[PDB]
Each structure stands twice: as C-alpha cells, then as structure tokens.
Amino acid sequence: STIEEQAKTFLDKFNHEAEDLFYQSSLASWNYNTNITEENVQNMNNAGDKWSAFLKEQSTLAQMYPLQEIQNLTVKLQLQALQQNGSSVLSEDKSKRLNTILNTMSTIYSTGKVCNPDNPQECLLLEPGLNEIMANSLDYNERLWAWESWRSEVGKQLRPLYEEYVVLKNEMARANHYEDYGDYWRGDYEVNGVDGYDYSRGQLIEDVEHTFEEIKPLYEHLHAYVRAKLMNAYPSYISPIGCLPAHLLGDMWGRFWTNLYSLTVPFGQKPNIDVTDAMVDQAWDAQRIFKEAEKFFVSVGLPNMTQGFWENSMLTDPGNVQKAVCHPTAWDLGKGDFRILMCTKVTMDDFLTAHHEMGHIQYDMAYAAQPFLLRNGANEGFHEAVGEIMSLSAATPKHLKSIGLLSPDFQEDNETEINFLLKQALTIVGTLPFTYMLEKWRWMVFKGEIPKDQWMKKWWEMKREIVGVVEPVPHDETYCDPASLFHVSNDYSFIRYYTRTLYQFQFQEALCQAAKHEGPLHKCDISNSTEAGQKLFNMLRLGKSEPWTLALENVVGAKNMNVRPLLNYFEPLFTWLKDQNKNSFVGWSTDWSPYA
Amino acid sequence: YGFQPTYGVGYQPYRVVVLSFELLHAPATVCGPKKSTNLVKNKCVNFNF
C-alpha cells in the first residue's frame, strides 16, 4: 500500500484534535495567569499534561511513514516535525534522571539566597534587592562583593549539576544521530529544500563570526569612550589602555549597558525625548493609548483588528483581591483567538511595549494562513524583529510630532539626535559581542572540544578577548559563572537574541528603502507608508512553510548575513565618537586586571 | 465541532437554510402574495377581479 497518500488523512485527523486540544490548553493557561487562584491550577495541569499525553501517541505513530519519497515539501516538513522523537529514546532511569535534574536546577537557580557576611540573617535574591544593588550605584566595593556573593553561593552548586547535564545532553545527541548538541540547537537554522535556498547547521558555526568582525572597530571606539567616562567617574580604578571591571558593567551579569547611560551621559544639557507629560496632560488613558497606536498598521497597510479581542483580553488594572500576572504576554490561543496580558501604564516605554506586543499580535494574525503545525516562524529571529521594528518606528520623534503628541515647533539638532543614538547603541550593539561569546562558549562546551576542567578559564580568557571584561578577583574551577545566568540553566537557546538584532536592522533598512525616505536611518519613519505594508505582509503570512532563506527575500534585498544597516544607523554616532577619543587608544589587551 | 463563544471570526456556528424552487408539470401550489388594491364604485374604470 502507498503511504505517501495515506499520510494526508492521518495528518488531517491529528490536526483536527490538536486544534481544539491545544486551544483548550491555551485557554486554561490564560485563565491560570489571569486568575491567580488554586482553582485555575488543577485545570492548567490537567489540560497541559493531557495535551502532552495526547501528542505523545501522535509522535509515536509518526515513525512508520517512510519519509523518503514525499514530493510534497510541506507534507514532508510537517511529517518530519511530527517524526521528532524528542527525549523519548532513553531508558526510564536516564529519562527520569534528566527530568529530575531539569526540575532541581530550575528550583535551585530561583532559590539563590546571599547574605552579608557581617549580618548573615538578611539574604537577597535575583529579584529587586541584590539586583537593585548593581542597578544604579556609585561605588566599587558594594558591586564586587554582591557579584562575588551571587556567583559564589549560586555559582558553586550549579557546576556539578551542569557537568552531568552536559554529558547527558551530549549522550542524547549522539543517540539522536547528532555529533553534538550544538547541531540540535542549530537544527532550526537549517533548510535543505529547493536548490539555491539550501543551508546547513555547520554553515552557521562559521557565518556567526564573519559578520561580527565588521563592527569590531566601532565596538572598540565604544569601549574606549565607556572606559574614558569610567575614569572620569571612577578615578584611579581603571587602566586607560586596559579594560573595565566586571561589576561596573551595569547589570547582574553585564548583559546590557542600559544602566551605564546615566554614568556615561554624553551631554546633560539636552534632555532625552519624553512625551509622558503630553499623555498625562492630554488625558490619554490606556484605551486611548492603544487606540491611537492601532492606526499605525492601518497607515502601513495591515487590516483592522478583529472584533472580540477586546472582550476576551484584559488590558489594565487588575485592581482588587482578584490578582493577575503583569508579565507581558500575547496569547495565540488557537482557533483564531488572540489575547493580551499586560499591565498598562501611562509611559513612553509602555507606549513602545504596547507597540511591540500589538506588532506581535499582527504577525500572529498574519501567519494564520498556515496550518496548525506551520503556524510558526521559520526561525526564532523573525517574531522579535517584527516586534521591535514598530518600537524603533515609534521611537522616532517625527511620528510623535505627526500624531500631535509633541509641539510642532520642535528645534531638534545634532546634539539630541546623537545623544539618543548613543543611548540606543549602548544596548543595541554593545551586547552583541557578549551574546556571540556566550553562544560560542556553549557551542564549544557541547562539542566536546574541551575537557571538563577547561570550562571557565577559557571562558574568562575569550570574554576578555572579545568584550574586555576581566575578573575583579581571581577565580578557580570551583566557581561557575555561566551557569549563574537565566538562559543557561533552563535549556534556553541563546542564539535567538543574536540573529534577531541582525534581522531587525535588515528589515528596517528594507522598509526605509521601500518607503521613499531620504536621510539618516535613525530618523527614517514608516508612518503612512502603504508600500511597505504589502512588502511586510508578503512574508508575515509565510510562516514555517517557506524556508527562512526564502523568507529573507521578500523584504530584504539579499539573503546574505552581513551587518550593513547597523553601521549606517549609528553613523552620526560613529563620527561623533571618532572626534571624541582622539588621544585615548581604541581597544584593549587581555593582560590587565584589577587585582594585579 | 468545537464551537465556543470565544471563537474568532468564521469559527462561530452559522445556521444556513438553502431554499430550492421546483416546478414539475403538476399544478402549482406555492406562489407569493398578490397585492389587492381598493375598489371604487360609480366610476367608469377597468378592473381585474
């Protein structure tokens, strides 16, 4: 009997039940989050585990089908998606131990209590508190001490768990016809379909760093400026030719430099753009904020939102004893049902966040044309790129003036534009080497190219080499700094944030070129641009059916991964930093340390 | 079906009736209403009783 034709009936029958079962599970999830009560927990657990226990047999049956003659690319992709065995290959002992280690390290990472040695009765968590200590501080000891505590009472017990977690993951990858688990995390970045659109897991291993070196001189100018500001603020602590300490980065792990903008403000005479006073004076409540932001997709060309989302979804003011979660989530519950779960307030940052989430909702309703299993992006860098495109567009003061949210008599000049550009680039491009080096370390620790002992010393060395952060205090192997991070101990692929940023500027420059705009890229605006709407929607509805290589062909000019738009965006910033650090050497060398 | 009020556009239950007209050679029984006007007496008129 032919099996290629019979696969369609099985897929349709599976999809029919999967639709409403996943819909009920998602509704249970929304109820549990919206209503924080014991009643909604049992329904959550029943829905989730019943959905998993239903999908397990669908995965089990999807192995007799000979996926070697299916000429239908969509059918082949759907079947191989259902052909995935997950972690249901190991024995009961190994699988249950893997579940145990996942749960125990998830619990341990959230139970980090660090008390002051002189007063050991007042510990702090990753929550506000210990985090607030480094959030905004002007000192040296209170940062290094808290850093060492957080990476000592949490960074010493995560290593024994992480070692065996790594070895078990590598064993499973070997049992799943993978040389190493990096290929498993690089499976999403692979397409082997039509000729000219083929791609491989091993190609990304090299392609990650080729496009990273073109912004290294710019990052070196940024590092020199940051270091000079640090000496101007922290005298006799940082060597001008060396690099900056670890606890002065601004975050718990120095992921971003958002908190360093206040310390390293270029010009305090020109204030940053803020229109919250305009909303408060004009009495723009949450509903008015959402409604005024709704017109933007209509101007771009996207259709009007579907009625009913207002009633199903809550927006603002959980209010009384009936508690609700404030975590920003855009629920795609299935069956065409969308919901929003924010805690809206009158803020410009809230305006940008609402723009981002409603852009996510627009993308969700856009790719609804694809079937149940193809209702997803080609990779993880497409959703966030679309979400942040509109945030970047709404950050433009031109749109603020056009909607009447600012006085039309503004006198913007190069000073405020450069200040805003520096504020943007302190996080947009400064964290790219951090993400690259963390991902490379995870790749090389899953590849087995290094022994267990050579895990963190090499990590520190190449951290100094790429970013320029050295140890405030020397560390030995008993510490484990990488595991003391959110996206390291919960099985989270950290490469999404690296590629999403590259996709963001590519899409933005593509829209600007197909927007009839002339001038700087940072001042480019896509408001009232009906021609960019069709260009975006041509791929917003493509979903997982089409290759990501094809996906990067309806908007961007070329599918190659080159950092073209980032250098263009901060070009006034590049030339303003070039005539700033005329005397100070750009770059750093990995031979200075605060302790030596 | 899995019809729910929370369902989106096009996912809601719609009641549909299809009416078909057939005119076999048998004498007709189904026809629409016929409008009847008023009557006037003592005036030379043309009528359609």
XYZ file of C-alpha atoms in Angstrom:
645
model
C 0.000 0.000 0.000
C 1.116 3.541 -0.750
C 1.944 5.541 2.369
C 2.516 8.963 0.812
C -1.197 9.375 0.071
C -2.353 7.835 3.362
C -0.239 10.322 5.339
C -2.638 13.154 4.460
C -5.606 11.526 6.206
C -3.583 10.807 9.350
C -2.204 14.355 9.410
C -5.673 15.875 8.998
C -7.173 13.648 11.700
C -4.331 14.530 14.071
C -4.694 18.245 13.303
C -8.448 18.194 13.933
C -7.950 17.031 17.524
C -4.742 19.015 18.057
C -6.506 22.277 17.183
C -9.154 22.150 19.899
C -6.996 20.326 22.462
C -4.229 22.935 22.234
C -6.944 25.607 22.219
C -8.368 24.303 25.499
C -4.873 24.044 26.992
C -4.088 27.635 25.983
C -7.391 28.847 27.439
C -6.538 27.025 30.669
C -3.160 28.787 30.652
C -4.761 32.190 30.123
C -7.234 31.518 32.935
C -4.440 30.425 35.279
C -2.399 33.554 34.560
C -5.341 35.984 34.579
C -6.936 34.482 37.712
C -4.222 33.537 40.203
C -6.166 31.039 42.310
C -5.993 27.385 43.298
C -8.956 26.520 41.058
C -7.162 27.515 37.844
C -4.048 25.466 38.723
C -5.612 21.998 38.567
C -7.309 22.792 35.245
C -3.959 24.061 33.944
C -2.153 20.883 34.968
C -4.859 18.601 33.570
C -5.009 20.480 30.262
C -1.237 20.601 29.829
C -0.481 17.007 30.726
C -3.473 15.710 28.746
C -2.253 17.641 25.700
C 1.236 16.189 26.160
C -0.150 12.668 26.700
C -2.190 13.069 23.502
C 0.725 14.394 21.441
C 2.917 11.506 22.603
C 0.970 8.881 20.631
C 0.855 11.167 17.594
C 4.650 11.362 17.760
C 4.876 7.595 18.317
C 2.738 6.731 15.279
C 4.680 9.183 13.096
C 7.547 6.735 12.526
C 6.140 4.052 10.197
C 5.795 6.654 7.434
C 8.749 6.361 5.012
C 9.852 9.996 4.834
C 11.999 9.372 1.752
C 9.544 9.690 -1.166
C 7.241 12.582 -0.168
C 7.424 15.002 -3.100
C 5.198 17.470 -1.201
C 7.625 19.770 0.609
C 5.001 20.977 3.093
C 3.878 17.410 3.835
C 7.485 16.253 4.229
C 8.301 19.124 6.597
C 5.158 18.528 8.666
C 5.863 14.796 8.920
C 9.498 15.296 9.930
C 8.264 17.797 12.517
C 5.983 15.038 13.816
C 8.726 12.440 13.238
C 10.760 14.018 16.052
C 11.127 11.639 18.998
C 12.228 14.308 21.484
C 13.720 12.704 24.593
C 11.567 9.546 24.467
C 14.514 7.379 23.369
C 16.447 6.935 26.622
C 15.705 4.279 29.207
C 13.346 5.021 32.084
C 16.207 5.624 34.529
C 18.072 8.096 32.312
C 14.924 9.947 31.208
C 13.606 10.264 34.765
C 17.021 11.460 35.940
C 17.004 14.071 33.169
C 13.592 15.262 34.341
C 14.881 15.324 37.925
C 17.963 17.380 37.049
C 15.911 19.832 34.974
C 13.471 20.370 37.844
C 16.138 20.572 40.548
C 18.332 23.083 38.709
C 15.273 25.166 37.820
C 14.397 25.234 41.525
C 17.983 25.938 42.621
C 18.525 28.854 40.234
C 15.411 30.530 41.691
C 16.477 29.957 45.327
C 19.689 31.973 45.467
C 19.924 33.458 48.965
C 23.039 35.573 49.562
C 23.524 37.152 52.994
C 26.054 39.770 54.023
C 28.888 38.072 55.968
C 28.679 40.518 58.889
C 24.862 40.182 59.046
C 24.085 36.647 57.817
C 20.350 36.994 58.591
C 19.469 39.226 55.593
C 19.872 37.425 52.266
C 18.820 38.739 48.862
C 17.527 37.219 45.625
C 17.806 37.904 41.902
C 14.601 39.939 42.467
C 14.840 43.661 43.350
C 17.257 43.909 46.214
C 20.581 42.327 45.268
C 19.743 43.258 41.672
C 18.908 46.797 42.813
C 22.380 46.987 44.397
C 24.020 46.974 40.953
C 21.016 48.533 39.189
C 22.215 52.077 39.948
C 25.151 52.537 42.326
C 28.173 54.844 42.531
C 30.796 52.801 44.398
C 33.207 49.896 43.965
C 33.001 47.532 46.953
C 29.213 47.106 47.099
C 29.263 45.881 43.484
C 32.218 43.471 43.580
C 31.026 41.981 46.877
C 27.499 41.374 45.587
C 28.819 39.971 42.294
C 31.100 37.550 44.140
C 28.302 36.515 46.507
C 25.819 35.876 43.692
C 28.421 33.871 41.765
C 29.697 32.032 44.876
C 26.633 30.871 46.813
C 24.872 30.185 43.489
C 27.878 29.669 41.225
C 29.372 26.721 43.129
C 26.477 24.232 43.217
C 25.322 24.752 39.619
C 28.592 23.366 38.219
C 28.166 19.739 39.445
C 24.626 19.689 38.050
C 25.667 21.352 34.784
C 28.527 18.919 34.123
C 26.305 15.834 34.164
C 23.548 17.777 32.400
C 26.018 18.493 29.588
C 27.209 14.891 29.386
C 23.632 13.555 29.342
C 22.665 16.058 26.643
C 25.675 15.043 24.540
C 24.806 11.363 25.024
C 21.238 12.021 23.861
C 22.547 13.974 20.864
C 24.774 11.020 19.966
C 21.785 8.688 20.344
C 19.792 11.041 18.069
C 22.255 10.844 15.136
C 23.879 14.147 16.124
C 27.617 14.516 16.649
C 26.989 17.142 19.343
C 24.088 19.087 20.824
C 25.113 22.297 19.057
C 23.703 20.745 15.895
C 20.492 20.103 17.839
C 20.293 23.807 18.692
C 21.378 24.582 15.108
C 18.600 22.460 13.602
C 16.311 25.494 13.465
C 18.966 27.308 11.400
C 18.911 24.774 8.572
C 16.907 24.379 5.377
C 17.626 21.799 2.660
C 14.775 22.389 0.233
C 14.903 23.891 -3.250
C 18.230 24.497 -4.969
C 19.708 27.906 -4.226
C 17.914 28.033 -0.854
C 19.808 25.184 0.834
C 21.532 25.709 4.174
C 23.321 23.642 6.811
C 23.889 23.570 10.561
C 27.660 23.784 10.140
C 27.411 26.864 7.931
C 26.123 28.990 10.821
C 29.072 27.931 13.002
C 31.355 29.914 10.696
C 28.837 32.524 9.476
C 28.202 33.799 13.018
C 31.640 35.394 13.370
C 32.304 36.570 9.792
C 29.581 39.225 10.091
C 30.664 40.120 13.644
C 34.121 41.495 12.783
C 32.808 44.398 10.666
C 31.521 46.160 13.811
C 34.555 45.382 15.980
C 36.285 48.774 15.387
C 33.012 50.530 16.232
C 32.711 48.460 19.406
C 36.326 49.362 20.202
C 35.515 53.069 19.900
C 32.501 52.463 22.150
C 34.694 50.615 24.663
C 37.271 53.418 24.658
C 34.576 56.047 25.232
C 32.983 53.984 28.019
C 36.367 53.472 29.684
C 37.209 57.181 29.450
C 33.857 58.034 31.027
C 34.636 55.457 33.724
C 37.937 57.138 34.607
C 36.117 60.482 34.568
C 33.666 58.948 37.072
C 35.866 56.357 38.855
C 39.392 57.799 39.039
C 42.460 55.630 39.673
C 40.422 52.422 39.236
C 40.508 51.558 35.504
C 43.635 51.497 33.350
C 43.143 53.673 30.233
C 44.889 51.141 27.982
C 43.350 48.155 29.780
C 39.660 47.365 30.229
C 36.739 47.969 32.629
C 35.827 45.821 35.666
C 33.060 43.204 35.731
C 30.797 44.664 38.431
C 30.770 48.149 36.851
C 29.097 46.936 33.639
C 25.654 47.873 34.947
C 23.740 44.593 35.202
C 23.846 41.436 37.303
C 25.960 39.790 34.584
C 26.763 42.789 32.377
C 24.372 41.618 29.665
C 23.455 45.206 28.740
C 24.737 48.725 29.393
C 21.348 50.388 29.903
C 22.239 51.332 33.487
C 25.576 52.789 32.322
C 23.933 55.539 30.245
C 23.390 57.754 33.298
C 27.024 57.348 34.362
C 28.293 57.934 30.803
C 25.764 60.529 29.612
C 27.240 62.455 26.638
C 25.539 65.822 27.213
C 23.415 66.548 30.271
C 22.257 69.893 28.880
C 19.947 68.355 26.263
C 17.270 66.142 27.866
C 16.092 62.918 26.290
C 12.790 62.725 24.433
C 9.858 62.105 26.780
C 6.169 62.608 25.985
C 4.560 61.045 29.072
C 3.724 64.584 30.192
C 1.867 65.022 26.898
C -0.245 61.918 27.548
C -0.972 62.863 31.166
C -1.870 66.469 30.313
C -3.999 65.334 27.356
C -5.585 62.569 29.498
C -4.524 59.665 27.280
C -5.660 56.643 29.288
C -4.690 53.070 28.401
C -7.549 52.626 25.927
C -6.703 55.898 24.163
C -3.042 54.841 24.021
C -3.959 51.508 22.433
C -6.448 53.085 20.014
C -4.049 55.792 18.811
C -1.363 53.126 18.305
C -3.858 50.968 16.374
C -3.897 53.410 13.439
C -0.247 52.689 12.628
C -0.832 49.297 10.993
C -3.708 50.817 9.016
C -1.329 53.523 7.786
C 1.263 50.872 6.902
C -1.429 48.808 5.186
C -2.301 45.984 7.552
C -6.035 45.311 8.021
C -8.077 46.374 11.021
C -8.059 44.187 14.118
C -10.788 41.591 14.591
C -13.634 42.373 16.975
C -13.778 40.228 20.123
C -10.143 40.543 21.190
C -11.214 43.489 23.360
C -13.669 41.437 25.421
C -11.609 38.252 25.792
C -8.368 40.059 26.656
C -7.666 42.246 29.679
C -5.503 45.358 29.380
C -5.126 47.362 32.589
C -5.859 47.495 36.322
C -6.086 44.021 37.880
C -7.090 46.082 40.905
C -8.677 44.291 43.848
C -8.101 40.924 45.579
C -8.586 39.254 42.193
C -4.900 39.177 41.280
C -3.431 38.848 37.798
C 0.013 38.399 36.278
C 1.735 41.505 34.901
C 4.182 39.575 32.703
C 3.804 40.889 29.129
C 2.306 38.064 27.054
C 0.499 37.931 23.705
C -1.579 34.747 23.765
C -2.290 33.000 20.455
C -4.779 30.542 21.922
C -5.673 28.937 18.582
C -8.852 28.825 16.505
C -8.015 32.410 15.567
C -8.237 33.553 19.200
C -5.817 36.244 20.388
C -5.489 37.817 23.825
C -3.275 40.364 25.567
C -1.881 40.207 29.105
C -0.073 43.426 30.084
C -0.339 45.850 32.999
C -0.593 49.087 31.039
C 0.507 52.424 32.494
C 0.960 55.946 31.117
C 4.579 55.733 29.961
C 6.582 56.225 26.772
C 8.267 52.890 27.492
C 4.761 51.478 27.920
C 3.876 53.013 24.543
C 6.818 51.203 22.934
C 5.981 47.943 24.724
C 2.346 48.139 23.599
C 3.563 48.798 20.051
C 5.828 45.741 20.266
C 3.095 43.458 21.600
C 0.478 44.620 19.096
C 3.034 44.071 16.342
C 3.436 40.548 17.701
C -0.354 40.182 17.530
C -0.351 41.475 13.944
C 2.297 38.914 12.998
C 0.220 36.236 14.747
C -2.908 37.075 12.756
C -0.725 37.371 9.646
C 0.735 33.863 9.638
C -2.689 32.379 10.471
C -2.954 31.182 6.853
C -0.530 28.343 7.595
C -1.822 25.066 9.092
C -1.616 24.191 12.784
C 1.973 22.913 12.716
C 3.153 25.627 10.292
C 1.758 28.486 12.403
C 5.287 29.421 13.489
C 8.225 31.419 12.220
C 10.986 29.861 10.158
C 13.457 30.645 12.954
C 13.374 32.465 16.296
C 14.692 35.763 14.904
C 11.572 36.733 12.932
C 8.978 37.362 15.660
C 11.171 39.672 17.740
C 12.425 41.526 14.657
C 8.852 42.345 13.626
C 8.014 43.293 17.207
C 10.957 45.676 17.563
C 10.557 47.253 14.105
C 7.483 49.154 15.271
C 9.134 50.060 18.580
C 12.000 51.608 16.605
C 9.484 53.389 14.367
C 7.532 54.770 17.352
C 10.782 55.919 18.981
C 11.138 58.377 16.081
C 10.280 61.947 17.187
C 8.846 62.641 13.720
C 5.936 60.272 14.362
C 5.470 61.842 17.802
C 5.161 65.290 16.220
C 2.921 64.000 13.418
C 0.332 62.489 15.788
C 0.212 65.751 17.717
C 1.868 64.178 20.761
C 4.545 66.905 20.663
C 4.573 70.600 19.877
C 5.118 71.192 16.129
C 7.686 73.924 16.926
C 10.451 71.498 17.934
C 14.033 72.550 17.166
C 15.844 69.210 17.156
C 19.553 69.395 16.355
C 22.561 67.087 16.063
C 23.184 67.120 19.827
C 19.941 65.455 20.930
C 19.952 63.077 17.951
C 23.490 61.955 18.805
C 22.561 61.591 22.484
C 19.573 59.395 21.614
C 21.684 57.392 19.152
C 24.310 56.761 21.846
C 21.590 55.744 24.307
C 20.326 53.274 21.701
C 23.755 51.884 20.796
C 24.767 51.365 24.435
C 22.473 48.309 24.290
C 21.719 47.634 20.603
C 25.281 46.760 19.575
C 27.238 46.657 22.849
C 25.695 43.329 23.873
C 26.390 41.646 20.516
C 29.928 40.503 21.495
C 28.501 39.275 24.815
C 25.854 37.172 23.065
C 28.360 35.913 20.493
C 30.901 34.836 23.099
C 28.302 33.163 25.327
C 26.885 31.234 22.369
C 30.371 30.229 21.215
C 31.207 29.006 24.720
C 28.021 26.927 24.842
C 28.793 25.539 21.377
C 32.347 24.564 22.314
C 31.233 23.031 25.616
C 28.592 20.926 23.844
C 31.085 19.988 21.101
C 33.435 18.170 23.478
C 36.446 20.068 22.113
C 37.469 20.949 25.694
C 37.711 18.838 28.877
C 35.614 19.430 31.980
C 38.414 21.315 33.750
C 38.906 23.701 30.801
C 35.421 25.191 31.070
C 35.651 28.626 32.712
C 39.309 29.676 32.406
C 38.961 29.617 28.622
C 35.582 31.315 29.078
C 37.185 34.149 31.043
C 40.059 34.430 28.558
C 37.856 34.776 25.481
C 35.469 37.025 27.425
C 38.431 39.353 27.961
C 39.456 38.937 24.317
C 36.068 39.689 22.750
C 34.389 42.123 25.176
C 37.135 43.267 27.541
C 35.921 42.237 30.994
C 38.440 40.810 33.459
C 38.000 39.204 36.866
C 37.691 41.624 39.805
C 39.011 38.709 41.895
C 40.830 35.612 40.558
C 38.613 32.553 40.179
C 39.348 28.833 40.373
C 37.454 25.912 38.869
C 35.066 25.617 41.835
C 33.200 28.679 40.519
C 30.765 28.535 37.608
C 29.764 31.984 36.327
C 27.989 30.983 33.066
C 25.543 28.726 34.930
C 24.646 31.722 37.134
C 22.531 33.139 34.317
C 18.865 32.901 33.386
C 19.237 31.398 29.902
C 21.877 28.792 30.809
C 20.188 26.543 33.376
C 16.669 26.257 31.904
C 17.599 24.814 28.468
C 17.170 28.057 26.524
C 18.713 28.606 23.097
C 20.585 31.889 23.457
C 21.343 32.410 19.739
C 17.883 33.876 19.044
C 18.845 37.259 20.510
C 21.968 37.387 18.323
C 20.231 36.825 14.982
C 17.068 38.785 15.796
C 19.066 42.019 16.098
C 20.666 41.442 12.692
C 17.222 40.785 11.211
C 15.788 43.939 12.825
C 18.079 46.408 11.069
C 17.909 44.475 7.794
C 14.111 44.694 7.803
C 14.203 48.343 8.888
C 16.568 49.340 6.078
C 14.474 47.349 3.598
C 11.359 49.235 4.707
C 13.232 52.547 4.564
C 14.379 51.833 1.005
C 10.818 50.811 0.074
C 9.425 53.823 1.923
C 10.608 56.762 -0.254
C 12.579 58.190 2.677
C 15.778 60.226 2.350
C 18.100 60.991 5.244
C 19.574 59.247 8.280
C 18.365 55.729 9.005
C 17.641 56.546 12.656
C 15.251 59.333 11.608
C 13.594 57.108 8.992
C 9.852 56.767 9.580
C 7.440 54.187 8.165
C 4.258 56.039 9.147
C 1.686 56.399 6.348
C 3.725 54.019 4.161
C 1.257 51.770 2.342
C 4.008 50.391 0.082
C 5.918 48.797 2.977
C 2.781 47.080 4.280
C 2.490 44.733 1.310
C 6.236 44.047 1.415
C 5.988 43.041 5.076
C 2.760 41.046 4.684
C 4.224 39.072 1.768
C 6.331 37.236 4.372
C 4.323 37.830 7.567
C 1.875 35.158 6.344
C 4.531 32.730 5.080
C 5.027 31.057 8.456
C 7.074 27.877 8.777
C 6.046 26.517 5.361
C 8.640 28.522 3.467
C 12.408 28.492 4.077
C 13.993 31.254 6.124
C 16.309 31.760 3.146
C 13.201 32.421 1.056
C 11.733 34.414 3.953
C 14.681 36.820 3.720
C 13.872 37.541 0.070
C 10.522 39.406 0.050
C 11.693 42.273 2.288
C 15.486 42.488 2.391
C 17.437 42.904 -0.825
C 19.662 39.856 -0.324
C 19.652 36.754 1.871
C 23.326 37.031 2.863
C 24.090 37.643 6.543
C 26.088 40.886 6.515
C 25.928 43.718 9.063
C 25.119 46.524 6.640
C 22.443 48.565 8.490
C 23.990 48.706 11.981
C 26.949 50.776 10.773
C 24.625 53.074 8.810
C 22.278 53.567 11.773
C 24.950 54.857 14.167
C 26.861 56.816 11.516
C 26.397 60.219 13.215
C 27.279 58.403 16.433
C 30.328 56.868 14.739
C 31.590 60.267 13.581
C 30.779 61.880 16.949
C 32.772 59.205 18.779
C 35.598 59.414 16.228
C 36.341 63.056 17.103
C 35.946 62.321 20.840
C 38.635 59.704 21.580
C 41.370 61.340 19.521
C 44.046 60.676 22.169
C 42.837 57.576 24.029
C 43.821 54.299 22.393
C 40.941 52.277 20.955
C 40.785 48.655 22.069
C 42.164 46.650 24.964
C 44.611 43.858 25.748
C 43.961 40.804 27.917
C 46.782 41.284 30.408
C 45.437 43.791 32.969
C 43.244 43.014 35.972
C 42.010 44.999 38.995
C 43.755 42.584 41.378
C 47.129 42.782 39.592
C -17.360 20.770 16.075
C -15.818 22.613 18.998
C -17.935 25.749 18.805
C -17.335 28.293 21.567
C -18.360 31.941 22.003
C -14.656 32.738 22.478
C -14.020 31.561 18.906
C -12.909 34.138 16.364
C -14.387 35.357 13.105
C -15.531 32.464 10.936
C -15.184 29.962 13.793
C -18.720 30.573 15.100
C -21.759 28.389 14.333
C -23.831 29.761 11.459
C -27.321 28.467 10.716
C -27.849 28.167 6.962
C -31.049 27.384 5.059
C -30.976 26.686 1.320
C -34.301 27.073 -0.489
C -34.755 25.384 -3.866
C -37.698 26.002 -6.190
C -39.074 23.193 -8.351
C -41.831 23.449 -10.969
C -42.811 19.954 -12.083
C -45.701 19.828 -14.565
C -48.158 19.292 -11.696
C -50.370 22.309 -10.891
C -48.589 24.952 -8.833
C -49.321 25.339 -5.124
C -46.587 27.697 -3.884
C -46.686 31.313 -5.033
C -46.038 34.684 -3.462
C -48.697 37.041 -2.139
C -50.760 39.083 -4.573
C -51.343 42.755 -3.841
C -55.011 43.775 -3.793
C -55.887 47.438 -4.287
C -59.035 49.247 -3.162
C -62.348 49.353 -5.006
C -64.223 52.448 -6.183
C -67.911 52.484 -7.075
C -69.824 54.631 -9.568
C -66.829 55.394 -11.792
C -66.041 54.073 -15.273
C -62.895 52.058 -14.528
C -61.128 48.901 -15.671
C -60.978 46.060 -13.152
C -59.184 42.736 -12.669
C -61.320 40.751 -10.226
